[PDB]
RNA sequence: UGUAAAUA
């Protein structure tokens, strides 16, 4: 409970309290971990403070290592820590240089243990984006280099610290993270994780030369391009493992979907998806990758993808069903055929550009459309029993009347 | 007919 001097006749905290009564009391730690007490502290802290009130606040909250961690790891104290940090960064007295290098020492001492903590992880992120950049970078160097970094990316709380590091720190200071993920054995465990799959995507987004990186120098673009390729080369060598994974399929989709990654989207399709379209279309998670490939492939690779589905597999020696018959009725493959039909119809309707590579590839979309149109025409009775077939039939009819 | 993130 709170200190006995701070309660009233009925055991509840007295009204009309001041900030220096508790600061002079030396009982701030009792106030910071109580809900009502910390509710009063963090509101009296947002008001105008004297230079000595800040002096007491800095020493009592971020002045001792053990007491600082005890508040950062506390459900209530972690909020008071973050506000005192902002006052330390807004008070340019003498102790400004000593206070945050001292604060950097306290978290670098307990880096991993704090990211894995549910409440201390917020002190890492807030200090990463609010401290001086020169000191926020030395914080990133405190990250482990061994198996503890794998546990940090896959942690429910610690994964956001790395996503924060990627967001507010220049790449050079966390370039080692890219290589730690780039190594084959670590790439498997992290991409296959519920939270690690999000970490990998966030790294690629910052490593992408899109509109959110036009402020970089070309020297910074070269360093980004070096880390970009290095990560892609590992991902593409393990692409089939990542494409069929529950979580890692979102990374192969993110690469193929992005126009600013078209150089690597073409390498995913050619060295992993090609010659495996029928197989990957029947996989629960890889079928989403197959859809994104059809939607975002360049028209030359799109032709080889179409021709593979239409004429890349031997028909069944007894029934005679080709890959089109198999996919149209498959529990997952039917969406891929629906993706092919939507693309072809979007092209002949003006909803999709047909000029690419200095030529109008319209005649090929019409060619692919006739193939689908006649298979749906010939199998209209068997397709009408399925939800997938009813949408293919009405799509062709809706296009007919345009 | 088919899938994903943590504080009062």
**Residue with CA nearest to B5's C1' atom:** A195
A369 and A344 in contact (C-beta within 8 Å)? yes
Nearest-nucleotide field for A202 (CA, C1'): B5
A216 and A180 in contact (C-beta within 8 Å)? no
Phi, psi of A185 (to 5 degrees): -70, -35
Residue A284 contacts strand B, CB under 7 A: yes
Report how this structure was experimentally obtained. Answer: X-ray
Q: Which of residues 43-72 of A touch strand B (CB under 7 A)?
A: none
Nearest-nucleotide field for A119 (CA, C1'): B7
Positive/negative CA dihedral, A179, A180, A181, A187:
positive
Nearest-nucleotide field for A199 (CA, C1'): B5
Tell me the CA end-to-end span of chain A in Å, nearest whole number: 75
**Three-class secondary structure of residue A66 per DSSP:** helix
Positive/negative CA dihedral, A8, A10, A16, A20:
positive
Residue A40 contacts strand B, CB under 7 A: no
Q: CA at A57, C1' at B5: how many angstroms apart?
A: 34
Nearest-nucleotide field for A285 (CA, C1'): B3
Half-sphere exposure of A229 (CA within 13 A, CB side): 6
H helices present in A169-209, as ranges? 175-182, 184-191, 196-206
Residue A198 contacts strand B, CB under 7 A: yes
Six token digits for residue A204:
């690629």
Give dist(CA A32, CA A86) in Å, integer: 17
Number of Cβ within a 10 Å radius of residue A302:
22
Six token digits for residue A320:
């005679």
Nearest-nucleotide field for A41 (CA, C1'): B8
Six token digits for residue A129:
């984006």
Q: Which of residues 210-269 of A touch strand B (CB under 7 A)?
A: 246-247, 249-250, 253-254
Six token digits for residue A214:
């036009």
Structural domains in chain A?
A: 1-402 (1.25.10.10)
Give dist(CA A362, CA A355) in Å, integer: 7
Half-sphere exposure of A367 (CA within 13 A, CB side): 9
Q: CA at A154, C1' at B7: how many angstroms apart?
A: 18
A196 and A189 in contact (C-beta within 8 Å)? yes
Indicate the resolution in Å.
2.8
**Three-class secondary structure of residue A29 per DSSP:** helix
Residue A281 contacts strand B, CB under 7 A: no
H helices present in A207-355, as ranges? 218-237, 239-243, 249-257, 262-268, 277-281, 286-296, 299-311, 323-329, 333-348
Residue A160 contacts strand B, CB under 7 A: yes
Number of Cβ within a 10 Å radius of residue A350:
9
How many residues would you count in chain A?
402
Q: Which residues pair with A13 in a beta bridge?
A: A7
Q: Which of residues 168-197 of A touch strand B (CB under 7 A)?
A: 194-195, 197
Closest CA to A76 of A28, A25, A13, A15: A28
**Residue with CA nearest to B2's C1' atom:** A332
Residue A291 contacts strand B, CB under 7 A: yes
Residue A329 contacts strand B, CB under 7 A: no
Q: CA at A282, C1' at B3: how many angstroms apart?
A: 14
Angle at alpha carbon of residue A82, lines to A77 and A84, rounded to 5°: 95
Residue A73 contacts strand B, CB under 7 A: no
Question: Which bases of strand B have any atom within 7 Å of the beta carbon of a protein residue?
Answer: 1-8
Q: Is A383 exposed, middle or buried, given 0-12, 13-18 or 19+ CB atoms closer than 10 A?
A: buried
A82 and A62 in contact (C-beta within 8 Å)? no
A388 and A330 in contact (C-beta within 8 Å)? no
């Amino acid at each position: 409970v709170l200190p006995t001097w701070s309660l009233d006749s009925n055991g509840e905290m007295r009204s009309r309290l001041s900030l220096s009564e508790v600061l002079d009391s030396g009982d701030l730690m009792k106030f910071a971990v109580d809900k009502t007490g910390c509710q009063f502290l963090e509101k009296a802290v947002k008001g105008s403070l004297t230079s000595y009130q800040k002096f007491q606040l800095f020493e009592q909250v971020i002045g001792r290592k053990d007491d600082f961690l005890k508040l950062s790891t506390n459900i209530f104290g972690n909020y008071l820590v973050q506000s005192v940090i902002g006052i330390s960064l807004a008070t340019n007295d003498d102790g400004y240089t000593k206070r945050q290098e001292k604060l950097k020492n306290f978290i670098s001492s307990q880096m991993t243990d704090m990211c894995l903590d549910k409440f201390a992880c917020r002190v890492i992120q807030s200090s990463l984006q609010n401290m001086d950049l020169s000191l926020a970078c030395k914080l990133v160097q405190a990250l482990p280099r061994d198996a503890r970094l794998i546990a940090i990316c896959v942690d429910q709380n610690a994964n956001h610290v790395i996503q924060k590091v990627v967001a507010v720190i220049p790449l050079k200071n966390w370039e080692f993270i890219v290589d730690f993920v780039a190594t084959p054995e670590h790439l498997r465990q992290i991409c296959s994780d519920k939270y690690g799959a999000y970490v990998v995507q966030t790294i690629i987004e910052k490593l992408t030369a899109d509109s959110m990186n036009v402020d970089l120098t070309s020297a910074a673009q070269n360093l980004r391009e070096r880390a970009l390729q290095r990560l892609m080369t590992s991902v593409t060598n393990r692409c089939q493992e990542l494409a069929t994974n529950e979580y890692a399929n979102y990374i192969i989709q993110h690469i193929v979907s992005n126009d600013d990654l078209a150089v690597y989207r073409e390498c995913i399709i050619e060295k992993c998806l090609m010659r495996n379209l029928l197989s990957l279309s029947q996989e629960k998670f890889a079928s989403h990758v197959v859809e994104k490939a059809f939607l975002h492939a360049p028209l030359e690779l799109l032709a080889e993808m179409m021709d593979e589905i239409f004429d890349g597999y031997i028909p069944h020696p007894d029934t005679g069903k080709d890959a089109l018959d198999i996919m149209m009725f498959h529990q997952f493959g039917n969406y891929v055929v629906q993706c092919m039909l939507t693309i072809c119809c979007d092209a002949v309707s003006g909803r999709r550009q047909t000029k690419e590579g200095g030529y109008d590839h319209a005649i090929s979309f019409q060619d692919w459309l006739k193939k689908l149109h006649s298979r749906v025409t010939k199998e209209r009775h068997r397709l009408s029993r399925f939800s997938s077939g009813k949408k293919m039939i009405e799509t062709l009819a809706n296009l007919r009347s345009t």
